[model samples]
Target chain A: PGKKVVARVVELLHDPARNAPVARVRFEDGEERLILVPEGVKVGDVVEVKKV
Target chain B: GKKVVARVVELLHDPARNAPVARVRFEDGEERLILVPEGVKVGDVVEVKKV
Candidate 1:
């Protein structure tokens, strides 16, 4: 669990299918993905993803 | 841009799930879930030290 990525939270959404909070994040490199919502994060927040 | 730091607040287990998920609380009070390694438990700290 040691990979890392720098990304910005672009939008927040609810995934009723997964029943989980999800976020739209764009990496510094321009790659985008949806991740489980992280605490304290808001749209425009720059966050780091570290594999745990 | 905003920074994030989180703490392991809880562990979630589901029989249909392949692995347990860690419920975390971020510094700003938002909560999210992550896959955690063994030995991590509630109250363990996990921070995105930098972004």
Candidate 2:
């Protein structure tokens, strides 16, 4: 694509509010952006961030 | 203690065809990637791909 899509993760904004952990994951393709999703992820976990 | 950041979802369109979803789960100020899952639907749940 255009930007390099790497897989980076932010801290969960809240701890399992329901079943998902709300956090932000930084990835490639979106070099200068933020990808926020329901965080079911943990610290030091490598997640897949696709470069769009 | 590893690589982490933030991201914005690019697009979530077309689920009745191949490559239905286009998710780029991203992080802030670092790197990103591209994923194409074959089995995703309008109400189907997916793995977070966390390791």
Q: Which candidate achieves the best lDDT against the true structure? A: 1
For every prediction, compared with the true complex, DockQ reads 0.10, 0.14
lDDT of 2 at B41: 33
Number of clashing pairs, model 2? 39
- Choose the strongest candidate by DockQ: 2
Model 2, C-alpha of A37: deviation from truth (Å): 7.7
Q: Model 2: runs farther than 4 Å from truth?
A: A1-6, A31-40, A49-52, B1-45
Predicted candidate 2 versus true structure: per-residue lDDT over A1-52, tens digit per residue: 1322235665545544323445555443333233334345665455653322
Q: How many Å off is the CA of B15 in candidate 2?
A: 20
Task: Encode model 1's per-residue lDDT on A1-52: one tens digit a residue.
Answer: 3444466789977656543356777764465666655545678887665434
Return the clash pairs for model 1, or none: A39-B30, A39-B31, A40-B30
lDDT of 2 by residue, B6-33 (tens): 3434435454432333444433332333
Interface Cα root-mean-square deviation for all models: 7.7, 9.8
